[model samples]
Target: LKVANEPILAFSQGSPERDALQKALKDLKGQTEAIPCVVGDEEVWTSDIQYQLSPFNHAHKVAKFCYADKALLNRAIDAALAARKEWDLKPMADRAQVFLKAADMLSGPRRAEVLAKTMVGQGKTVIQAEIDAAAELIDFFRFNAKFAVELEGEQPISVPPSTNHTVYRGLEGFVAAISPFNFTAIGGNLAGAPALMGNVVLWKPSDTAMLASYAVYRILREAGLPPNIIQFVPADGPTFGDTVTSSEHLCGINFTGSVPTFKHLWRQVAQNLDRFRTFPRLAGECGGKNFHFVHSSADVDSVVSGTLRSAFEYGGQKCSACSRLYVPKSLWPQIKGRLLEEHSRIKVGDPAEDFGTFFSAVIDAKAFARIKKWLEHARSSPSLSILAGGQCNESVGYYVEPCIIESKDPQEPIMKEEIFGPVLTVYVYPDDKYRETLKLVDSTTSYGLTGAVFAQDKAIVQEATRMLRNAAGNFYINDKSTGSVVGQQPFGGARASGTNDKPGGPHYILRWTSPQVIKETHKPLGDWRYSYMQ
Candidate 1:
């Protein structure tokens, strides 16, 4: 089947999507949704209720959800294993149909629903929500389905009398999908990818992203996904980790989150290695301390505009957002001048209230504190100095103004650590030291997730690209570090960043599958003896 990317909708003023999103925002703002964990055909709720607070407005609760207890999470795993017998046997085409239908539904009738949920619940602007919850989410399903079919088309060749075939089999048991809160599409992908490969999944969505994730899950069900194929279980972090890792039925874990959490999960699986039905395939997309390197020959406006959008968009919550920037001494003044002026124009307010708002609060109290601590460090430290913003006001919401800092020491803690907020730290170096600076940037952080090089000179661009080849997985030239498309840029990184699985690319689905080869012989007796054999 032919597959094309789902077009991203423009939510411009007076647009149809804008009007629809406005209505959805009005409808959802006044109400708090009751979200329940789904196991098989059951809608399970517990006595322990949790509230998912909207980051934009702390007092406003968007979802009243119950975390799955240990017993409930175990039951969800059991449900997935039970469902796998039929699901794993279903043809790839049938599996593709469920996801394909979901993609269509997401792009059409449910577009405004997800955008609104992401805006109010997950704190994204309308444009951000459209690209993420609608466009990218739809792209994940459609492209993954297409890629699976393409993979299945690759079979071993047959010689004269014998025919050979490679059967793409789903894993023996279930995949536990632990997704993060940054992107709504990631929630869908972390769960949906394994499930599309005819493997059942235990989907544990991030706490803050529940509303949009639940919306996608429901759409998946309505699009004809079998009940227990993807059991939606949101539980306490340790409780969920312990339950999944301990289970012999868990065959895989599709994860996207922090380094410590991913490492913890890996260690947990390793500790319980003796009990598994098969060695669990662990794939994680850990967040990165992304960078942007600017040369003296770089266009001034491109550097300013690209860096601002990359560093500050979505409150810099994106994993690939540029946190560390390196600028040549000759260009630092112009870049900083443009940066302060341009960054000032970006209005940080509630996107729901004002369609023109570019950014909002950090995800929650925890995120605000993490970022505020670093900003405070910048203010207090000898090597660090705040250039633009140092104050944070969480009095109403978890709002931190997009802070920019200039660093005196390149190897300081501020440059190495990932603050995961709208904070950018700049390091200015001599123009003659371009090659030396590229080497420094390469060794600055262990993360190799995403980075960009901005240079107008062809020779220097090529030199920088080669020098920092291993520094980033998705590297851009004359562009921002963020925004990798599904088919175009398969996004992941090496070193400590992640496993570099490249989920959005064509080959990502292969990780969810195991192949068994079979050879059928038409002339068995003839093959028993060679020409010279007795």
Candidate 2:
């Protein structure tokens, strides 16, 4: 009898399972090694390292496999430029249909795998990673795609000239998208915006989180995106920046990251202003030291909860995460106690587990070290007191316990610098000094993000809102300043934030296009030779 065919017979007749008592011992075979499959183009080998996932909280390694290279990048640009005529010729409804299809594909069951992979790759707690990353991605695609149809051309005007009439249309070139490592969905949306506008995109994803970036790239390709329409390149930062700023094929830049980096690239294009076929468009979302003000009327519970969620969620590793808190002196006694109590209940553990951990881990050792040093320095200062968790784990991995530093001096490093970690600084506002508190908010180094105010009085709330108009890109009332929706509340900043490139809105499509109008007259008048004929 064939042992493989009949498991029951094989087990009863002293086959491998039936001979379990002997504990089968066989001679060693020849050597064997496991090889991990590389994603994207096979020829372009990536660095020999892999990004460590969370739950395990490991160090980052470089990978070699990338879908885009210099040759493919140039080819994609060429094809997109060449295909402009055909794409632009298609009606706006047709272009919108294509984007809508891509959006549906992103929102379907395929999102399950995409979310799971992102969670593992980025060390996101399944909930934080899956819900925020996957859902947000689908929302972005769907919102932007639907709006592409809504961005209609201006109504044509009637004229006395009887011979001819004219109409306008969309773009016929390539758009460049440079995204960051923090939010996977937001990064994807930056590139997806231009692609949905009937223009091709050359996306340069952050090397730190290329796995998820590459995955999104594959999804778009599988969704029947035309060849040379959306390309992904995980290259060195400077090299990619040079390519985007200098390339003639690039029609615009959808950027999200640091202001310093964006400013450098911004200067690059400005330098070669006269060389390009058109003045390229630039839209960006740079970092900000977003803050929150706790008014005297704010409910103590809400204030504490809002602060906890905004400052520590995702390890405070977000562009709009509230890093600073300004508390009025009138309510400090009660509010401080509740904040400490809540801080004690928060857990620090593997993101996959159900301990209700506040955050998984810092992204890497560098971030971990930076946070630790800053905390240590603050701890030594006379004016600062460590209100809660300041412990860190070095041998196991990059886990920083949520820390609260109460500072009398507003100029402390924890108060001034962009901590970009789970460190929160609470500054007390003197009594009858609401105006002074407003100055504090405006004094921060960042200006291109969101801020929140917790207040109950109608007039005070309105006043606070009015005064902080220029303090942030978005504002909140009696709530945390995290979680901005796509279509309804498009995301961006000002000053150091970006060039007002608000994504997922009516204006987003315009950044990817250049409109040139052609006016014609139907009738020609006979000209006399008397004017200048000698």
Candidate 3:
């Protein structure tokens, strides 16, 4: 099978691909889908009936979904455990085939459908949807499949009197894949990686991302994956967390979400340590307060353009989005002028109508409210001044215009917190404080996720890189903090950000596997004891 990163499509004007995508969006807008809490082949329901609304048009429903009750969640867990028997024994090549087939189907027939659902449901533009639901999803599958095959071939070397063989075995029980709403590709990988390692999974997709997730579940089944192998379960967060931690069959949890949620899940697993058959593996990728640090010697265009794209793209909803930027006072005038000039022209509306829409809206009402509170604080605070775009309106949609706030105090809460919206806070430092600012940037935030240093000076860039080494897991030089590819830049971070698992890299698949080493002696031992015992 050919293993490669999927090419990102350019949705140029009047293009055939654009027409297909438009058609897909039109079809989805016309109807609301019925999403369920699936267990094996059955679509189960609970008392909690919910609707996933379009972030851009909150009145219109995209999907009517049911949250899984504790009973239904347990049933889904049972389904995964039941299917694990046969799935655990399949050869690695056979397991790889299933994912590859799914990848092929997604790359062709299901691409536009997935992209449109994401656009309508999660409020992403066409280009944003294309990069995530289509390209990144395909990359996660193909790359993980290749890594699984390589892991299967890896064996321990034997020295002398015995021959050794190693088997790459799945964990004793099921994996609970709790995916976030931001990236459909993360949902696919969070669930797909474990199952590809011969483990069955109960995949609980985030409530906000339900529409596109249903599409992915359908493609997986049509691609010949057993329904029992991955139970499509969309559930209430607390109940699902409580139930899964209590189950004896839970061997692992693959998570991506907020810091508090991941911590709660980890504490739950630790609390129920004695209740399980084995120690459950806990893994997570939490949110971060990412940044852009611009030295005085940086290229003016690179800092302006890169910061604009990273901060405003997808409404700055990406975990790696540059929420805080540090610019030297010497270059602040040029940077601020260019930023305002470009920010004035950014269009935020329905992406299906205008291909050039920069971004749509935040995910839901809760996100809108959170961003609203920060904007209110910015308005009243004396030390902080809104540079541009602070207006928020939920009357039409969960729309908060891309904002730029200039802060006098570098350690202000606005600069430290993770406001996952299209808001960029700038704190200009004196040119003389360039070296000291690097230390302040490192110590100001606990999160060490993605960060970029924009400097043309080779020595300054080198010094800044060394000083801010632990400040970011995925670091960039003269580039934006966002847009890390699969094969090239494996992603994740440590400190308060996440486990730094580096999921898209080669070694991530190994976390799902449990290897067993066996030895066969060609010569019989003369005695039962060691030679020293004689």
Candidate 4:
């Protein structure tokens, strides 16, 4: 029997986990190391080096890492293609153990180290880092293992004369796991899930998250995963994509990033379709303009808390973070007042120094600039009113204050675009315009990733559910739009969102595998004799 793992530490006051995490931070800060790209069992060094800096304190250098050029990326693809035969031949139980052991190591020995790195390197608060690096990553590993076993047990039905069965094999070649910077757990799962299904992976982690992402690579290796089975190639996206997809053996892509990039990759795969042996599996989860709608009968306290956390946690960098809001005119006054009061109490600083900080800086200089651009647009727009916070400072760290904008136009740029920061735009609709609001919410953006609706009225809740059925892959009622737990809420979306292959579900592993059916006849029969002929 298999059971889901409970979330790890909560980092509450005076907890041992908090104390351990603090010590780990102190220890990691004392040392600076060089990170290298790994191909097979060997470490490859390059002339081009990128320095890793703390997002919360950019003046401090955390670590230095090298990038893989076109040549190196080619070598990584070849290594994965070469290693696939042996890795796929290994028993499924053996492959499962690699990730199972990784889960154990992540939740046990490496928990503090990973959490501290996430806090310092990725600008996550202690609690945010705990939920991501420790708890969610552990869930991905354990649940994926269980899902793989279940997948392998799926066989075809057979009649009496013939024995029919099916076998699942890894893709014909290799997988490229291109991950985003928001969640370290996503980085691991993007690669680890496929690798668990007997496919070799060439992983390209986000430049902003290399420190914590590299930690995942190291932990996977330490957990007895063969080096060549998953190669770590950190390089520019275009250069890496050009080289990786050019390979004749490129079999699939597991990506999590922007909509344009995912679309570009899809085009590249199609253009080069003739060059590959099979149609490469393209699984992606892209940009989202997630939303939350409140009805007149909604619980004000629930709406306030849910909106605050969904729009501001980790500075709203998550793909599922609520960026747009629909509020009924009858309830906007109370919701707005309480939201302002609550927003002012949020603590923002370096999480490494202050574990109690609820918010931190954005990922890096590039993210800061982009988010600042959006804020400027909101400030200049006459149709928009800044209700609470809208400030950005980048002297020491790239920090953007959590902002709430009220837009008179339901179709304003702030409501339609995915700013991907702690910026929430609200559109107040007439209480009677609830049905119209649903249409606006569904049509505002191309993405359909995550969404939430709050209403005490049962019929209204059911109506919203029916209206926005196709709007979000992960939908919530009377809850925040963020924080989709593994197993409980298998995550992904439709429309412009990549393939709706929900990660952490039983079917996710199926994308990485190809199934073959076998029909065996035990009894000897007269060949070429058919019922029609008789």
Candidate 5:
């Protein structure tokens, strides 16, 4: 295993020191009034210390501070909308160059620092945090910037009139970006994509992941973006939602997080239907109960490795984490044995370990409590066998031991829920029930984030492939469903998973642009002003 020193340089920056102070003060006032709570009860969640990627030092655990007020949010949005005109008019090559520079800043000397802090703060493994933080950010920068040039509107067909020529292009506008904690890149991608497409963004980051999101905004500013073009408000989700949804100028929303919350926000937008302004654009990535299917013919080693990585990486907190598994009856014994064996080998420790810690602390106390209760329920189930991990370690924060639950009943509660922990529920499937097995996987949840199938038979793989074609944001053949390449393979689920707003792909940029057509008449031959032709 490779080990690098923790990141030392602080990557979080907003404006010049003076401007930052002013913005902070303004944001603070707004946040305080909008989202004030009792002191001790509001714990400041930090990233894992092991990853060495903490966002702020003493500031990381602020007792209670404001992010922004309504006025500040409005100011930020207005400034962005005004600045977008100039930003969009700037040569696309220049924009691309700035993005390239920012990408370098993220991947170069500063990489270790970013990775370390993200892992440490979020309780993720060093490699997982580092790769995710670097790769996803670079993807947003490179792909979005490159797409800026390609956003030129479709060519107009020639009309045989006395005749006019027309051209279509996007106009400057305001966008609100709300991001989640599980992946900091979601914030970077959601906000950065719109900014690249000539729309200014109002970004509201998840309280837990704000540090990484804050750091990313700093990198963008360093790459020469104007202040206020992308506003960062660290307020509660409900307040931020109200501010964005109520505004008439709020042109669009680029979001990534929970389905229920997004649904509420979506409802608010619908209620404020205004035929006056442009219809608001909505894009989001939400929840899922992804699964892994292991066929009787699957290689045991490959299946075990795939399942372990999918469900345990980042402690199974990822949206695409495989929470359920279907093992063919013939291979249930072998598959369960392999899974338990591998689960035993998992190293649960602090994130700072050089070789890497297996299970890290979760985001907060509430989530910790939720998962613990769920674990308790699973352990109590008579039909389930707790092959590994059914304990919680509160001594060192909110950490749950890796859990592997074995059951034959597909309808078991453990097999049904989307447990966002290092918990995997394995169920048995009969050989004759392959078709039924396929149906079970698809009908499992309201979420369609991601799923994987493991099989040696080309026909089985293809069959499974067809069955789950629309079952996930990204489906896999023999690999884990959690990881995805940015530009090549787009990520975002259907049904409740997402609105197909797969960031880092070409389509993401398209969502940010507002098309406008300008026409010029070449000749005016018909109208002679009632016989007064010249």
Candidate 6:
């Protein structure tokens, strides 16, 4: 029997695990460090330097990192190609051992360090860091390893007096893994999943997440993964893209980031089509303008809870964060009142100093500025009304209050586009206009990543499900849209969201491998013969 890992860690009061985690955080804060790029088996430090800062307090420096130039990127690519032949030749079981060992380490010895670093470096609360850096990452490693084994066991049927076998081989060349800043699990999965399937990888993690990314690399190395199998190249965007994607040995790209960048990479691959040995496989998860629809018969408490967690948790930086909402006019008053009370109770501050901080600063100055600009627009617009918490103060940290806007026009920019911050816009519709509102929700955004429907009536729930069938890849019933578990939901989406390749599922590993069919005959014929000749 196969059992999946639960993707969460509990650190309740009086728990020994919580004590260890707190001790780990204290230890981490006492040291100032530097992280270097890993090319092949060596660490390369260059003159180009960048400081890793805490978003909660920009004056605090966590670590310093060396940025890779074009030359160093080329070296990383060469190392991955050199390692490919020997690494892919190993038995599938051996490859599976490496990730399984890594998972064990994450769950046991390395858990506290990873959790602390993610909280400090990425501004995640204790619970957020636990779910992301500790539990979710462990799930990815263990589940993907099992999926790899299942993939290798599949074989073709044989005919009488003959034998047929199928072998799963890695791609013809190396895979370029570009990860995002939001989730440490995504960084590990984008690199480790393909490498676990016998493919060499050139991993370039987001600069905003450099510290946690390096810690993940160290854990994999400690788990006995050879350095050349996955080369870590920490460089700026243009330099990394130009060198890695332009190589003739480029086989595939696994990316999770902005929509513009994903589209740009797609165009670059198309422009350099003739330079590659094979057509490259592109898998990406980009932007989302996710939503929640509340019918008149919805449970008020459930809607309030789902909206608060889905829209304000993690400061609404999640790609699956509910940025838009549709509510029946009859139910808006109660939902809005409860949301205001809950929103006022949420505390935003530096997570490093206090583990109980419910909300933290956004990533950097650029993200803060963009989110601030949107807030200003909403505050000044006559067509929209700010119901609660429209304050944005960046004097000390990049802090923005959880803002809720009630828009007169459904086609407002804040309603249609992805803000990707602590902002949720709502539109109240007549109870009789339920069907029309569902259509509007489906057609407003180009993305279909995640969404939720809250209703107590069985017929309304059934009708909404049927109407918004393709509206979201992971649809929630009477629950929040965020926090998708690994094995149960198999997270991903279609349309503008991504390729909908369901990363945590069994078929995800197959994207990195190409299958070869082998057929053998017991007897060989000296001359070609057919029934027509007879």
The Cα local distance difference test for each model comes to: 0.91, 0.67, 0.90, 0.88, 0.70, 0.87
RMSD of each: 1.1, 10.4, 1.2, 1.3, 8.6, 1.3
- Candidate 2, 1-534: lDDT as tens digits: 000110111223444332331221011011111112222232244443334333234532323344344555565567567766666666666665655565566555455445544544454554455445566776667666556555553545667774233333444456778887777786678777777666767677765556566667767766766655666655566767776666765667778877788888889989878777777777888877888898888888888898998998877888788888999898998888888998888877655433256577776777889999988987798988888888888565578888988988876767767777888888888869978878778776656588899989899888888788888877889888887766556777786767776775657777766555566666786576667785
In model 5, state the lDDT of residue 212: 60
lDDT of 1 by residue, 1-534 (tens): 798878877767798888989998998876799999999879999988998989989898999989899999888888788889888888899999999999999888898999999998989988889889998999999999999888888999999698999889999989999999999999999899999898999999999999999999999999999989999888898889989999988899999998899999999999999999899999988888899999898989998999999999999999899999999999988998989888778899898998789899889999999998998899899988888976789987899899999998999998998889999999999999888999999999989999999988899988988998899999999999998989988899998999989999988999999999999989855466688875
The best candidate in terms of lDDT: 1
Please give, for residues 229-314, the per-residue lDDT of candidate 6 as tens digits: 98888888877888778999899999998888889999999999999999999999986889899998888998888888899888
Ranking of predictions according to lDDT:
1, 3, 4, 6, 5, 2
Backbone atom clashes (below 3 Å) for every candidate: 0, 11, 0, 0, 22, 0
TM-score against native, each model: 0.98, 0.84, 0.98, 0.98, 0.84, 0.98
Worst 10 residues of 1 by lDDT: 524-533
Sliding window of 10 residues with minimal summed lDDT for model 2 = 1-10
Cα lDDT tens digits for candidate 4, 356-434:
6889999999999999998899889998998988898999999999999999999888888888899999899998888
lDDT, candidate 5, 175-280, per-residue tens:
8888877886777888777776666778887776655666687788788877656776666578778888887877888888778888888898898877316778
**Candidate 6 — worst ten consecutive residues by lDDT sum?**
1-10
Q: Which stretches of candidate 6 lie over 4 Å from their true place?
A: 1-3
Q: In candidate 1, residue 15 scores what lDDT? A: 86
Better of 3 and 5 by TM-score: 3
Q: 289-346, model 3: which lDDT tens digit per residue?
A: 9989999889999999999999999999999999999999999999999999999999
- What value of lDDT does candidate 1 attain over all alpha carbons? 0.91
